[PDB]
Scaffold this active site. Structure first.
Site, PDB file in Angstrom:
ATOM      1  N   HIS B  41      29.738 -18.792 -32.934  1.00  0.00           N
ATOM      2  CA  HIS B  41      30.823 -18.348 -33.856  1.00  0.00           C
ATOM      3  C   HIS B  41      30.241 -18.084 -35.247  1.00  0.00           C
ATOM      4  CE1 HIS B  41      32.233 -22.805 -34.720  1.00  0.00           C
ATOM      5  NE2 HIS B  41      31.241 -22.456 -35.524  1.00  0.00           N
ATOM      6  N   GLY B 143      30.886 -25.660 -43.174  1.00  0.00           N
ATOM      7  CA  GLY B 143      29.430 -25.416 -43.200  1.00  0.00           C
ATOM      8  C   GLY B 143      28.649 -26.448 -42.390  1.00  0.00           C
ATOM      9  N   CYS B 145      28.981 -26.987 -39.170  1.00  0.00           N
ATOM     10  CA  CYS B 145      28.786 -26.492 -37.784  1.00  0.00           C
ATOM     11  C   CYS B 145      27.281 -26.364 -37.507  1.00  0.00           C
ATOM     12  CB  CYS B 145      29.560 -25.199 -37.529  1.00  0.00           C
ATOM     13  SG  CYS B 145      31.294 -25.532 -37.103  1.00  0.00           S
TER      14      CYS B 145
END
Ligand SMILES: *CC(=O)N1CCC[C@@H](c2nc3ccccc3s2)C1
Ligand SMILES: *CC(=O)N1CCC[C@@H](c2nc3ccccc3s2)C1
Lengths: 304, 304
Positions: B41, B143, B145
């Site tokens: 993603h 941020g 991830c």
């Protein structure tokens, strides 16, 4: 979202941990530049663990009696001294992984991470506070001595703690990296009783702010109080007094959440007076006092 | 003595964390050998965060559209593929700090450490469990991830988790390192409700053993029970069923403490039926379920 008891990454401190052996006694050392710091009770021969005279014990020791092992390679000891309750072993090699570091003596209420080590090998990392009675509620087995507490500011490791002692009540006493014990504790196998373990009021308030910020708001009341009034309630519940310094330090959390510090004080007062009634705050049934205001801001803003 | 929520040292995983940027989207990657693993993603352009077709989105991307930064040096991307919900970016340089590693899919109840990262920089480390509803109660800002969960066996990092999602209830969903989500979660901005977050009965029992081992014994009762009886009580209190496998796994703690597993079951039953009455166990007002039996043995034996 989510709030967790979070330690600093341990990498920079992992690179500093060595094994120190004096006779048959082994514990952990901290290798910074060409010096290895360790608890001086490395020199105690499984017999003088009662009334040691460290100066006299040390006369019998030489550079070559201290065995320093970094990974599976030995360091050559070219000097040794006693500074308070630590030994500084001069080695002939600078630690190539020495980070930017300071040594700092922290105050009660201050939080730090511990890299628990055994034979210079790190086994785990946890978050601690220096308790108002100058103990820490650690996790430490035999051979864990020389394990260090630290804070990281970007790439600088501030070393605040070295592990020495378990009190008979299973709490922990240690030194700063100049070898001065936090509190009245001595590196001696003697009845040593810790004082009153009071709750760090400022840290409870920061954590109540952390909760609001993460959606847990059930405990926000309609009331306010004064520093004097709140402090009568604190005193009764073995909570540290709240000073204007504590209020100032909470300002930014107050700002971000739009809850006046003294309003949050009144919420705490009710939680003390009424208990949780079987509810939880950030998945806790008691009031957490081992996050500082600085800690909450860090974890509620993603600082690295 | 003392029992602490303890993470593995993060050093070995710190050395693997990089920044991945696709267009204006930045999150964290994991650099092992010449591959960088990140959540797919990263390719979502702050607009298609609702119903992405990743295959179609990916057609528009090239090797040079993925910006990989390890410290303040850029890695050259020489290939890219999608495996389930992760991207594997082939870089032209092997990570010189690649530890011995596996990828392992863990079961619910299994504990792991998370190195929370921002722009490839690690900010903190906490201990987690995979919940029976296949969520984790993490701490993760924007941020974060690509932050990874792991276990360490001596010098081998078993990577079990990569961070992808916050559910609207503020819990966390992620993938193994083959990019298969734990549970029914999808990398899509859609109403996704987690199921019943049940208590990990086996982990509560291990932690009750950890407590006995550390002196907190007030809750040891005079009673025993059967697996069937205990399990009626568990069911009522949203506790996972206890199997003979759980009993077997607790054997060594049973052995060390001389408290039969089923006796400890009867103690738990009473604590569920009667509550804590305002007392604590290892400084907790609720029953901790995020230490495995394997975790307790580790911390009550000083394994490195
Ligand atoms: C804490 C630890 O791991 N240690 C292992 C080496 C010796 C041990 C000592 N404890 C005491 C307590 C009082 C006096 C002397 C000593 S040595 C520390
Ligand atoms: C978790 C994190 O740090 N992220 C930052 C980069 C983009 C962000 C995305 N979240 C979603 C959710 C659903 C679909 C697509 C995306 S990108 C992840």
């Amino acid at each position: 979202s989510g709030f967790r008891k979070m330690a600093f990454p341990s990498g920079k401190v992992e690179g500093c941990m060595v094994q120190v052996t004096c006779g048959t006694t082994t514990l952990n050392g901290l290798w910074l530049d060409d010096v290895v710091y360790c608890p001086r009770h490395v020199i105690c021969t499984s017999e003088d663990m009662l009334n040691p005279n460290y100066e006299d014990l040390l006369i019998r020791k030489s550079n070559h009696n201290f065995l320093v092992q970094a990974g599976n390679v030995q360091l050559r000891v070219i000097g040794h001294s006693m500074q308070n309750c630590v030994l500084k072993l001069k080695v002939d090699t600078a630690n190539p992984k020495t980070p930017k570091y300071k040594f700092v003596r922290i105050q009660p209420g201050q939080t730090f991470s511990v890299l628990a080590c055994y034979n210079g090998s790190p086994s785990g990392v946890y978050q601690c506070a220096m308790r108002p009675n100058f103990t820490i509620k650690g996790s430490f087995l035999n051979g864990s001595c020389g394990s260090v507490g630290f804070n990281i500011d970007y790439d600088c490791v501030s070393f605040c703690y070295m592990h020495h002692m378990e009190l008979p009540t299973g709490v922990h006493a240690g030194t700063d990296l100049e070898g001065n014990f936090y509190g009245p504790f001595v590196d001696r196998q003697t009845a040593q009783a810790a004082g009153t373990d009071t709750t760090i009021t400022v840290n409870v308030l920061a954590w109540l702010y952390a909760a609001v910020i993460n959606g847990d708001r059930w405990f926000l009341n309609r009331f306010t109080t004064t520093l004097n009034d709140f402090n009568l309630v604190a005193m009764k519940y073995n909570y540290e007094p709240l000073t204007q310094d504590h209020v100032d330090i909470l300002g930014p959390l107050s700002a971000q959440t739009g809850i006046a510090v003294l309003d949050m004080c009144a919420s705490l007062k009710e939680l003390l007076q009424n208990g949780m009634n079987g509810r939880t705050i950030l998945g806790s049934a008691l009031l957490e006092d081992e996050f500082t205001p600085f800690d909450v801001v860090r974890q509620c803003s993603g600082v690295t």
